[PDB]
From a paper:
Focused classification, signal subtraction of the MukF core, and focused refinement using neural-network-based regularization with Blush resolved a 73 kDa region of MukE bound to gp5.9. As observed previously in its RecBCD-bound form, gp5.9 formed a parallel coiled-coil dimer complemented by a β sheet of the N-terminal strands. gp5.9 bound along the DNA-binding cleft of MukE, overlapping along its full length with the DNA capture site. However, the orientation of gp5.9 with respect to the DNA molecule is broadly similar, in the sense that the long axis of the gp5.9 coiled coil aligns approximately with that of the double helix. Moreover, within the resolution limits of the structures, gp5.9 positioned several negatively charged residues (D11, D15, D21, E24, E36, D38, E43, and E45) near positively charged residues in MukE (R140, K150, R163, R164, and R179) or MukF (R322). Most of these ion pair interactions mimic DNA phosphate backbone contacts and thus prevent the natural DNA substrate from binding efficiently. Therefore, although there are significant differences in the details of binding to individual targets, the data overall support the designation of gp5.9 as a DNA mimic protein. The structure revealed that binding of gp5.9 to the MukE DNA-binding cleft is mutually exclusive with formation of the DNA capture state. We find that gp5.9 targets the DNA-binding site of MukE, which contacts DNA both in the capture state and when DNA is entrapped in the clamp compartment. Although gp5.9 targets DNA-binding sites by contacting residues involved in phosphate backbone binding, it encodes sufficient specificity to interfere with select targets.
MukBEF folds the chromosome of Escherichia coli and related bacteria. The SMC protein MukB dimerizes at its ‘‘hinge’’ domain, which connects via the long coiled-coil ‘‘arm’’ to the ABC-type ATPase ‘‘head’’ domain. The heads are bridged by the kleisin MukF, whereby the C-terminal winged-helix domain (cWHD) of MukF binds the ‘‘cap’’ surface of one MukB, and the N-terminal middle domain (MD) binds the coiled-coil ‘‘neck’’ of the other MukB. MukF also recruits the dimeric KITE protein MukE.
Numbering used by the authors:
A (entry chain C): 191 to 197, 263 to 327
B (entry chain E): 9 to 213
C (entry chain I): 4 to 49
D (entry chain J): 3 to 49
E (entry chain F): 7 to 209
F (entry chain D): 42 to 55, 69 to 79, 89 to 101
Write the structure that this text describes.
């Protein structure tokens, strides 16, 4: 929520690994997202674009080499 | 004859898998440590080689790789229907959802479907699904299946890694950032869309 | 004779296999119902 | 990180399997589209 | 490892290669007509046989001089199989290429002759099943059959077995690459008898 | 059980899927069957 505001023995070991993974994930997320849209404009603009998308459809491109033909 | 580093890289046993994968559209994220490292070491020469095929090699700022054919390409190109683009945009959003962090990046298709119906004009998806449908349960289920088909098509391209033995969950990779190119710039989406067309990113429909 | 794969790749392959199988099974019924609709329309027209 | 070790005779099976599923699915897509065109023509004939 | 044989690099450096590669991976039966492509393949055959092996694909030269790519069950390049009616059209094209009249016609045939050949030497019931499983055996079915035969002929032209002549699609010429559909009848008997036997058996 | 940690699969064995999830409505563990530990 803070980000939203502004832009027996074995159990311990497993919980520690889970927490480490959690921290890794939060670090990954901060790096990938907050630097890009430090001002939150990107997400709002995306919301609105999806909402009004149908007014002008469009589609992007990706290379698709023809598959190899073969017989039985 | 051939640059030394290009020749050395081409002989690398890892090359054929990439060469066949990329020309089928696959985007390469950060996850594939070995493949991504190989591309990092030999970006310049690989770019020079493919440029002889009359196709371009692009490394967007996010850190992924993808192949973009030009007008005179020697390998065909293709596009994807409206529903797939809608699903891609929704996936792009979920990546950014601040409330998501509790989920560590794993998701479920139930959330994907439920969220989608909060934005799109109910009929305006129904018409693409079935003209006669006006909120019936059967046509809602039909759309539920169509979204799964679109998601499989999307995964083949490399936008999401499946997880576990149950299909009802998946993971998102950073290559989805591509769907935001429309809103990348602060100018009017329309002129930006035409600029994207001119750059060859997307063709109008 | 033995191939080693990262856990993630194998998991992805298995998940994709199951997803594709489910999609194919669903689409079979979809085609069946479409053809039944065509048959019923043809029968009622006559 | 973790790895999985498998013999070739087993590995090749899933690679064949997924490809067969994909081809069958595409063929079914095409046939469904053809059936859709037929039903649309019949519908416009009725009305 | 041995990074690169000199001849392999010299071959990959030839400016015409990229088009040849993209076409080959599409399965096109590159033949003699493309004198340039044939010469280039002749110069650097063995080494291209070596390289493509990494893809788990065999670059095979048929006895009659043409070249095509035959992959194995473990291909690293996607492969797709064409429909049966395409195979029937291929076999029929194989038969015509042997007609003595080819020399008189220089190999020029029009789609009408091929359509008549298929219709007369093919089972009507099987074809009617092919065109539409709900087919009523009426004319509209035969018209759509002609349309799809035209489409399959176009696909085969993409494979490169046949050539379109001038700027009218009504005229086309056959090349020696058609034997890929007749290699199964390499026996020394009459080609007509062998093809008729195979078609009767459903092969 | 000696493990001391249960996965989602064991729970679902204990619209079947949707009703089960609604009944459930947690520690994510991608390496665990179903990627969930409760």
């Amino acid at each position: 929520q803070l980000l939203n505001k502004d832009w027996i023995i074995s159990w311990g070991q497993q919980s520690i690994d889970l927490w480490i993974g959690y921290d890794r994930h939060v670090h990954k997320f901060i790096r990938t997202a907050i630097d890009m849209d430090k001002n939150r404009v990107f997400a709002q603009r995306l919301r609105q674009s999806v909402q009004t998308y149908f007014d002008e459809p469009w589609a992007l491109t990706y290379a698709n080499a023809d598959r190899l033909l073969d017989m039985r | 004859v051939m640059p030394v580093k290009l020749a050395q890289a081409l002989a690398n046993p890892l090359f054929p898998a990439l060469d066949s994968a990329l020309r089928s559209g696959r985007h390469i994220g950060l996850d594939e440590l070995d493949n991504h490292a190989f591309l990092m070491d030999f970006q310049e020469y690989l770019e020079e080689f493919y440029a002889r095929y009359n196709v371009e090699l692009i490394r967007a700022p996010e850190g992924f790789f993808y192949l973009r054919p030009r007008s005179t390409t020697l390998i065909p190109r293709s596009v994807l229907s409206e529903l797939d683009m809608m699903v891609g945009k929704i996936l792009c959003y979920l990546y950014l959802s601040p409330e998501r962090l509790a989920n560590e990046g794993i998701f479920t298709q139930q959330e994907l479907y439920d969220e989608l119906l909060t934005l799109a004009d109910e009929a305006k998806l129904l018409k693409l699904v079935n003209n006669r449908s006006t909120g019936s349960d059967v046509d809602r289920q039909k759309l539920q299946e169509k979204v799964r088909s679109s998601l499989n098509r999307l995964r083949r391209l490399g936008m999401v890694w499946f997880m576990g033995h149950d299909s009802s969950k998946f993971r998102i990779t950073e290559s989805v950032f591509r769907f935001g190119a429309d809103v990348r710039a602060g100018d009017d989406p329309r002129e930006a869309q035409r600029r994207l067309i001119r750059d060859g990113e997307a063709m109008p429909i | 004779d033995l191939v080693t794969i990262p856990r993630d790749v194998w998991n992805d392959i298995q998940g994709y296999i199951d997803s594709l199988e489910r999609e194919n099974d669903s689409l079979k019924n979809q085609l069946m119902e479409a053809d039944e609709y065509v048959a019923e329309l043809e029968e009622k027209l006559n």
